[PDB]
RNA sequence: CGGAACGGCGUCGGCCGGUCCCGACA
RNA sequence: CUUCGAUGUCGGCUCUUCCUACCGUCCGCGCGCACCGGCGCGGAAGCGUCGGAUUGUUCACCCGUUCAAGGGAUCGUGAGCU
RNA sequence: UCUAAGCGCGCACCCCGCCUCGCGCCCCGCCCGGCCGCGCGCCCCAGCCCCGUGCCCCGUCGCCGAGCGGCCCCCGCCCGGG
């Protein structure tokens, strides 16, 4: 399951993702920079800076690790919602991939969105929301420019590919009059309605 | 209870872990910023410290006591035998971080650089670059690959090797260093400049100028295992201390129970 | 939620062979609570304790509710400071249905539970007589308003397991 | 906020409640939260329903103020609103959705086999159109 | 300094109200200080 | 059905287009675009008037319709007459010299309080700074946008700040004297 | 095998019926694809199910028994109690009788 | 959001009055 | 209440860390803010808060300087010392 | 009317750079191989531009090739001097 993280609440989607990982669903989350954390940015930065204050005093190396990159922040959120010390849960964390942007062949995978966990429906207009990407630039991420420049290139290429898909799809739909018609008649008209 | 008196911590915790350096030689790490459009220039060189001299210079600092006065000042001579370009490396700016597109090596690699690739050259196989030389040597392989760098690479660097035979050193093998081509009007101009110096020596006089400021990166002299007083500058305790005066007396409070990274401890000093 | 007319009188005495009968319109969840409220009132209003008197008849009056009417409720609630008096108007189909809306808005806004609030009176008020604007805006002949919560169709997304291909438009 | 406004006569497709899946008309508005809805020809008995359970539809029926249930039925019958809405894309889906609800396990088995024939066929059709 | 220019400058620097707690500069007619949130005490002092 | 609605009237000279909550207004002095998508408003054109209409104005949403109506009308005023915000430099002993430098695109204020530091304030895009020859020691800021002119003007007043002292005794600076819809 | 062409409906073994305190390793909670309400479980109640043993490669059969919650999940019992390394693995509810 | 006396033109809901088409120096 | 088949009990010395209820420096703002210097207040814990005479002293007291806040860590710190 | 929308400026603090380490990964050279998978419109939510669907069969008959991706693979000491 590849889920675009754009417009999604961070916790609400992480909870769906966690149940899927534990049910063996192999999820990949893309565009994690565009996920949303509710609340005014100033207060969400203070909450993400207060977390980085808590570090083991004797050796900071042995203590909590705070991940600046948004994809890593999303992975740590799902880790809190997963039994990761147990093997059932370490095997769940293993089947999870978090990506900022749609980078390798995640681009060619079909992508889905969880409507309920999306911000527009989840939080009232005038709630005040921020994107994980800007919170992460302020806590330390150095690659926000990089994932913008790249994402612009992918979107430009996608537009060219779409026009190519549009004409081919007209032929594909036109050609769909074979035994597809027989299946269609015996699938929906057979009163299944599907 | 309160420390009772105000003193700074002894030592910079930034320079921790104070461990022997695991890189083979000092490594440039960050190269100066590009400032695209500048006169095309190389940014770094490798040299061997030769010694110190002391010079008498005329000072022109205005509003200084030493203005229009002569000053004897220490100088360090670094021997800088000419380095020879051996490769062109291009790195794209990727959302992961600078990612190397490819390294197009020279048609011919000199014996000093080649001796770096093996632990004992006399008894070695001598198999390195054997196929590469045949694939190249027409110039087509070098130019077609160089074109790939122009399309994808955003940062162009050049690999160069020192000539240790022109030095009084006992090294024989040559250090390979990446020097970034900087200030090009465009990356293709950087690749064209980079190919002009390929297989050809580059001199310290070309890379730097007099009056310019440079930063020298190197591994410090070693002093071996060293105690807290030499390694961290702690005060030696009173003579009456049993078990010695050269020690940090209190390594911490009862709580935190564990000893902390901040407290000074004995170990490698160089 | 129900609406009952609980009738009651003190038990006949030698001094008073026929005692006066009291009738009270009590809105309550069930007959048992309705008869408790009737005696809570008669104990204070008429000095008739439950053990002193008897309930002649508890009669559930059901109502026809096919048309919306503005029901005005006057009540007294005891807050953390002390008893206060309040008049609330609710537009609803039936008097029992508007008492539910009043006790929903008394717990939510005034934080008063059913046993703290005592209803002085419930009486249907016509459009001209409405004194509260939240009820008045609706009373005007034609009310056109956008759907107040059109994003609430996220009930659809719980079924979808939140794995829809496109983000649904509202 | 621009079209589809809660008003008298607005046809509503109930999306929650006992009437889930049944259309109705908003006879009156109690408040922002609730409306009185009646579906004389659609099987909804007049009741007060929270606007959350009533998805708005484009069609608005012409009703008199306070039109009872029988008079509403004559007015609802007179309007072509219900018939046009079932000819609509939403109405066409609602009819298909109704059939999908009454599917037993044996029906579901035939449906999922037929779905596989479509999935494989699409690949066969799209392999020709390369 | 010109007197007319002095008035404009003093409107910017002298004319004002000061909450006795927030010490915040407040509008010439104010009932509450913005920073001290409703402090009803305010004044300002002439040179 | 509550909807706080304020309607302005579009000036005939101005041509106004609203798409979503972004308003593009063009008259004689030039086009101004402002985006009000932060706020939830039913901006409605047609006729010759713009109604803002915020539905369900429960809390501070009642404040929004007048604010947006004022903003659209401030835009309509600027694209016609234009906004000028005259500012007068005030000094006691030290003449302050302000020189318009980048072809009416920056101001350079020097000799403020005999301060060696020279302060250059660049104007926001689309605002010109000039020195009123008639008024004397006055700088006229002219542009279509009211808030660009006003931001440009307050930066001017924020640079010229006496470092400490008593501000009531030491009043020296650039102070906006006249803010008005006038002369571009 | 016994099951080669059986069409089946994908399902998942999501863990044994349990409380934080105790696990009843006799009953197994199964999420059936296409069942989202307790009422919908009625259709898949009593139907045959099977999980493919990871080591054996041979199906362990079972029957769906009673609905676990309001969410359509069902409680199922198998000939042998499931191992626990099969949690998250897919169970198959066969459309045909056997 | 352990917590007080006290403040709050934060936002909804009341209670009790005055001015109110006798439209709240002209 | 815990420890009496034992948690080494004052101070110093050494060395680390922390707190803010901030003394100086930073940023605002108010003054009975002309300047100079003070004084109040809000944010602010990065750095500084020392050298000595007497006392075992913690504290105290005085001298001096670049003028010198208050604390916590088993009253931090004895298989570190004295 | 500095705030409610919106905007500007803004602290020795904070974060980052520079720097110290650095698991991993990368390119290259030797080498040139094996294995696995099959799936892309984007934006917007007070225009939501016609919605309120789809998928619902990862073995369930699906696995060719190609392409786009992944993964594995591979890389000596002694001895002497610093």
Helix-strand blueprint:
The structure is cut from a larger assembly and holds 7 protein chains of 7 kinds.
Chain D: E1 5-6, E2 10-14, E3 23-29, E4 34-39, E5 44-50, E6 54-60, H1 70-78, H2 81-86, H3 89-101, H4 105-128
Antiparallel strand pairs in D: 2-3, 2-6, 3-4, 4-5
Chain F: E1 3-4, E2 7-9, E3 15-19, E4 22-26, E5 31-35, E6 49-51, E7 54-55, H1 64-78, E8 83-90, E9 97-100, E10 106-110, E11 119-122, E12 127-131, E13 138-143, H2 146-159, E14 173-180
Chain G: E1 9-18, E2 23-32, H1 38-41, E3 48-52, E4 59-67, E5 74-78, E6 90-93
Antiparallel strand pairs in G: 1-2, 1-6, 2-5, 3-4, 3-6, 4-5
Chain B binds 3 RNA strands through residues 1-10, 12-19, 21-22, 29-30, 87, 89, 91, 96, 99-105, 109, 117, 119, 125, 127-132, 170, 228, 234-235, 237-238, 240-243, 245, 247-256, 259-260, 262-264.
Structure description:
The PDB classes it as ribosome. Keywords: Ribosome, Translation, Giardia, Eukaryote, Eukaryotic, Macromolecule, tRNA. Giardia Ribosome in PRE-T Hybrid State (D2). Chain A is Ribosomal protein L13a. This is part of a larger assembly, with 7 protein chains of 7 kinds. Chain A is 52% helix and 7% strand. By secondary structure, chain A is mainly α. In chain A, α1 (10-22) crosses α3. A 3-stranded parallel beta sheet of chain A has the order 1-2-4. A two-stranded antiparallel ribbon of chain A has the order 3-5. Chain B starts with 40 loop residues before the first strand and ends with a strand. In chain B, a hairpin with a 2-residue loop joins β6 (83-94) and β7 (97-105). Chain B is α+β, with helices and mostly antiparallel strands and 270 residues long. Chain D has helices at 70-78, 81-86, 89-101, 105-128, and strands at residues 5-6, 10-14, 23-29, 34-39, 44-50, 54-60. Chain D has a 5-stranded antiparallel beta sheet. In chain D, a hairpin with an 8-residue loop joins β2 and β3. Chains in contact: A-B, A-C, A-D, A-G, C-D, C-F, D-F, D-G, E-F. The C-D interface holds C 65-68, 91-93, 97, 134-135, 138, 141-150, 152-153, 155-156 and D 1-2, 4-8, 15-16, 28-33, 36, 46, 48, 51-52, 55-56, 65-66, 68-69. The structure holds 3 RNA strands.
